């Protein structure tokens with residue numbers, strides 16, 4: 001039995017292609033469910049059979065059980081526990097959950113930081129433990145599982161929580177928070193502060209950096225004196241999302257339909273500048289407009305008296321993206337270029353359109 | 369980001385699956401065209417683009433530069449030039465041309481034969497060259513390139529080439545032709561007498577050491593890879609032998625037949641008719657077994673007898689029209705031919721094998737080899 005040296009790029013093409021295939025299949029299947037010709041069904045079923053089996057084989061080439069990374073943790077946790085004179089009940093779940101070989105080497109250290117973090121500022125000393133009337137032995141859980149097109153990983157504990165007020169008063173000092181906008185902030189955007197470089201040595205920002213370079217996402221959930229639950233979501237296979245194709249200076253960009261609110265057709269008189277940015281008011285609501293070409297360091301090419309503004313949506317605050325044209329909707333395959341786009345504020349990645357072409361994905365959050 | 373070592377067992381599934389996808393695409397398109405469907409043209413065009421792109425990257429992976437086999441030739445040619453007391457100007461081109469890994473191991477020996485052949489009986493001794501007014505030093509070119517889903521390897525001469533009249537003369541003595549009559553067939557047609565086993569030397573395939581390999585054997589190897597061989601020569605000008613090798617999958621329609629519970633495939637291209645028959649219809653004349661169809665006495669062979677342990681698959685090879693007896697037919701099927709090399713090379717009965725939808729191996733029968 002032999003093996004062959006295969007370039008990592010080739011395995012990436014296979015991945016993209018498979019994702020493309022998933023979409024092609026699905027579409028041809030949907031555009032002809034009405035016809036009820038037995039000969040046709042049997043051909044469709046064959047296509048799907050081969051398509052599904054093809055995806056399987058690519059997965060086998062790329063997948064690996066998360067055991068690889070998980071296995072070394074109990075001992076490390078056992079030892080981190082000794083140094084900090086505190087006993088902990090460590091529990092791992094779904095160690096057999098499979099993920100991309102690429103992830104094993106990289107997710108290892110970020111996961112350790114979360115476990116260590118839990119053992120320091122999570123689980124409290126036996127003194128506090130008893131004062132709050134919580135069990136003497138603390139609980140630390142590392143979970144792994146599949147959900148949709150994501151390899152989900154969570155680290156849970158019954159520590160001291162986070163105390164959101166600690167973050168508010170601490171954030172009011174340096175930059176961002178004023179004070180009256182803090183009392184109007186969502187509960188997740190305070191736990192999100194935890195990622196800003198100036199807070200809380202390694203931090204917590206560096207962990208999210210890694211998970212993002214892998215095209216994954218990180219989340220925090222905590223309750224004062226109850227515990228903390230940090231979630232990491234990793235792509236299982238490539239991500240397929242519906243997007244709005246937009247044209248600017250003849251180039252095509254994609255805006256995730258998920259973030260889109262409604263599309264306007266604003267004019268020049270319709271714009272009014274207030275200090276640093278331009279804005280439009282819609283039903284008494286102030287929405288800051290941004291010309292995509294100004295954001296991408298590009299040039300003007302005939303200012304159309306009637307412009308089109310894709311009004312986007314961030315958690316609680318919304319904006320507007322003025323573009324040249326609106327090509328239409330499209331199901332697209334997001335490429336594994338995490339390392340590449342994680343450094344760019346303007347884009348969140350590159351996608352593969354049905355066309356067969358590549359379009360950058362406008363990163364709405366990075367344009368505020 | 370370097371590389372990753374993948375099991376060939378998985379990479380082989382990709383080869384088989386990609387075959388099925390192509391076939392699965394044509395199947396669906398055909399059935400669509402039958403019942404007349406039109407709205408599915410864009411999504412279908414995408415599928416085909418993807419299908420095509422998948423095939424390429426899947427092939428590309430197994431590929432490697434021909435420079436793997438080419439690089440060892442200069443020294444070998446320099447050495448073969450020494451033994452024959454003759455200097456040669458050897459030139460290689462397109463060493464960077466890629467082809468399937470399978471071919472590297474197999475194409476090596478066949479190409480050495482052509483090089484040696486050229487250096488030996490092709491380029492004349494220096495005295496002769498100055499007498500014919502050709503540059504004293506002989507030239508030999510070994511080149512490769514891509515010419516539309518094929519790797520074209522060429523070995524070219526400056527030598528004496530070969531005289532068509534000298535071969536016709538021998539083709540006369542032993543069977544092949546008339547004193548002149550049939551000889552009026554195109555120059556290319558008359559060069560293939562070099563691909564006949566009995567030509568040039570003696571026959572044992574094991575007997576290479578002490579006599580030679582034989583031009584016919586080179587053709588067989590390149591064909592077992594599903595390639596094609598061609599020759600071109602001009603008296604006292606030179607010789608150019610071309611070898612073509614497929615860059616993609618070869619899909620042919622074949623008749624699946626069963627013998628002793630094993631499945632064999634007979635290329636539909638040959639079969640002219642299929643009819644059910646019984647033991648009593650097989651009349652044994654000389655040593656041969658035959659059947660009578662509308663009064664035509666037709667030669668017949670029991671497949672389990674040709675190999676080693678009823679339906680009559682009448683085929684047509686050139687002039688020959690004979691039948692192949694089997695236990696039962698398992699209908700038609702589009703199959704993908706797989707590369708092996710020195711495997712089915714010596715076996716005349718087979719021209720290779722194909723993989724079936726269910727994952728079972730199906731030996732493809734060589735009609736002309738019976």
Ligand SMILES: [Hg+2]
Pocket residue numbers: 242243329330331
């Ligand atoms: Hg869509």
Ligand SMILES: [Hg+2]
Pocket residue numbers: 621622700701702
């Ligand atoms: Hg067929």
